Design a binder for this molecule. Structure first.
Ligand SMILES: OC[C@H]1O[C@@H](n2cnc3c(N[C@@H]4CCc5ccccc54)ncnc32)[C@H](O)[C@@H]1O
Ligand SMILES: [K+]
Ligand SMILES: [K+]
Length: 546
DNA sequence: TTCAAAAAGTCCCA
DNA sequence: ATGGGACTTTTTGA
């Protein structure tokens, strides 16, 4: 339940909020960690504060109560007035209390402002100058359902649907940050692009000035943790310019301890820096350099259609228990299943550019099983081996589905037709024409072209441009970066891809057909495909004027 | 009735 | 062991 932030990042975040604090003008800064754990951030805040007071102790002594400002009194003053922390874990607070106490070697006891509580429910009696830390990340599946009711009712401005718990910590931190205060936190990066984070992005943009965003993309910041990180620094200062510094990593393979400090890494060639006008952020935050922005805007202005305009999108089958319904095509159990019940089944790894690998699995479309007495053998010997787990699906407990039915079987006729399929998570654009009525789970998305757009766009033309290097770069500008070399390819962004028709349509389509013809050969010469792709990329770059 | 989003991913190996 | 790569289920709110 407790996660250790790397020391190099903790030091950076504390320095970010405190390095320019005028301790002479305000010797009572309130610094808060809203989920402080064992005190990774707060113990470093202590050290930074102690040097700050000690370096200026005589100036404080002269300006203020000279009996109060002595070096021997710095420890007590820091704990009474400056350091605040809250965490749900009682043991961690106890350890942090000891660590703060042991900063100096009984006299009258010193009150330490540490609270064991739910920070999202605490009645905070005052605002804070500086707020730092690493909040909990809990998504919609791992969050207890009784708690979501409170979040949906009290944090509705940032928390709906598939939002994350750390959205609410952003809201709490902002709300209790003083005027002129500064906050700096490390959270997942996904809210920067995700559909769920739209409301949170709106809340940040209109309530604070975002000073800086450090985007680590798919780098592994937390050892043995499958998460992708970013650092946000923001303030409530009266400013006029409100430009954001964006530091975006260039190589996801770096080990974070390259230098003694993080700011050395940010200035190095391992990162790129650029500025974004906060006032120009739409509901989407497009955080790219001027070359990429110029590139993105050209494509948007040139393309008159989007995929959503011309296509019908849908998510794949969700059986609710794949082991009950999915069998290898050579499994002897399939002799028990009438072939009218069997569908070809593919995984995301089966989707290549332009074409799908031949399927090795079969789906039992159990929705078409009329009743339990007529296909008893299928139920008793195949599906019923998982009857307990099948019965625990939500729609079976409510009686909407029979225990042997697919949870979300969708419409068969959507799959049993010519269509385009693509993996839900990939390192690159992989859009394939499906000729074989393939079904799939939710790791593969599909679409088909609307009837009224068939005479403007063909499937062969679409996989041509969509698989091109231009469109690979174009999609990744705004795509959701998930983990190292993985982007989400979900309809909420894939269907926003814009497309064009011009004089190059026929040659692009013809090149795509040549590629498809070679790829479907037995003795395929993969080499010529790459040359045809290079030729097609040139046509597309000519078409879009890049 | 029934859509689609969600990585403190998950699991394996050298 | 740890770090790094291949690959991706079904729960869930709306
Ligand atoms: O993971 C980083 C650190 O965050 C701490 N942490 C976790 N959840 C909280 C929290 N409220 C949450 C909101 C949802 C909920 C439900 C039940 C109980 C608590 C809470 N408030 C303060 N600290 C909290 C952990 O202990 C860890 O050291
Ligand atoms: K004085
Ligand atoms: K990562």
């Amino acid at each position: 339940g407790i996660y250790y932030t790397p020391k190099i990042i903790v030091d950076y975040i504390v320095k970010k909020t405190l390095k320019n604090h005028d301790i002479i003008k305000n010797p009572y800064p309130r610094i808060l960690d809203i989920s402080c754990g064992c005190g990774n951030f707060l113990l470093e805040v202590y050290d930074i504060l102690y040097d700050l007071f000690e370096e200026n102790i005589y100036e404080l002594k002269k300006k203020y109560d000279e009996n109060y400002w002595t070096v021997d009194n710095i420890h007590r003053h820091i704990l009474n007035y400056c350091i605040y922390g809250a965490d749900i874990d009682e043991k961690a607070i106890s350890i942090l209390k000891d660590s703060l106490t042991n900063k100096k070697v009984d006299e009258s006891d010193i009150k330490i402002n540490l609270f064991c509580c739910d920070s999202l429910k605490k009645k905070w009696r005052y605002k804070f100058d500086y707020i730092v830390g690493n909040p909990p990340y809990i998504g919609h599946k791992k969050l207890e359902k009784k708690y979501k009711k409170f979040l949906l009712e009290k944090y509705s401005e940032v928390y709906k649907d598939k939002a994350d718990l750390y959205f609410c910590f952003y809201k709490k931190i902002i709300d209790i940050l003083k005027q002129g205060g500064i906050g700096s936190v490390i959270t997942p990066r996904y809210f920067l692009e995700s559909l769920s984070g739209k409301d949170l992005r709106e809340y940040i943009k209109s309530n604070v000035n975002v000073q800086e965003i450090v985007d680590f993309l798919g780098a592994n910041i937390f050892k043995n943790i499958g998460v992708s990180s970013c650092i946000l620094t923001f303030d409530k200062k009266k400013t006029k310019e409100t430009y954001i510094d964006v530091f975006k990593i260039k190589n996801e393979d770096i080990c974070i301890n390259k230098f003694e400090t993080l700011e050395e890494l940010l200035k190095s060639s391992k990162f790129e820096h650029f500025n974004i006008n906060q006032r120009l952020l739409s509901d989407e935050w497009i955080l790219v350099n001027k070359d990429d922005e110029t590139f993105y805007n050209k494509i948007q202005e040139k393309c008159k259609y989007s995929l959503e305009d011309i296509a019908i999108s849908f998510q794949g089958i969700i059986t609710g228990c794949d082991k009950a319904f999915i069998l290898s095509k050579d499994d002897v159990k399939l002799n028990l299943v009438d072939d009218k019940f069997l569908k070809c089944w593919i995984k995301s790894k089966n989707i290549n550019k332009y074409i799908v690998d031949k399927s090795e699995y079969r789906l039992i479309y159990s929705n078409d099983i009329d009743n339990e007495n007529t296909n008893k053998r299928i139920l008793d010997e195949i599906i019923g081996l998982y009857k307990t787990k099948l019965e625990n699906r939500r729609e079976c407990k409510s009686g909407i589905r029979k225990w042997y039915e697919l949870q979300w079987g969708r419409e068969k006729l959507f799959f049993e037709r010519k269509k385009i399929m693509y993996p839900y998570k990939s390192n690159e654009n992989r859009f394939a024409i499906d000729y074989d009525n393939n079904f799939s789970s939710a790791d593969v998305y599909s679409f088909f072209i609307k009837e009224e757009y068939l005479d403007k766009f063909s499937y062969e033309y679409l996989v041509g441009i969509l698989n091109s290097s231009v469109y690979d770069k174009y999609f990744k500008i705004t795509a959701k970066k998930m983990s190292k070399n993985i982007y989400d390819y979900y309809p909420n962004k894939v269907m926003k891809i814009r497309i064009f028709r011009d004089n190059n349509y026929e040659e692009i389509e013809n090149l795509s057909k040549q590629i498809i013809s070679i790829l479907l050969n037995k003795s395929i010469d993969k080499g010529k495909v790459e040359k045809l792709q290079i030729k097609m990329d040139n046509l597309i770059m000519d078409s879009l004027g890049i």
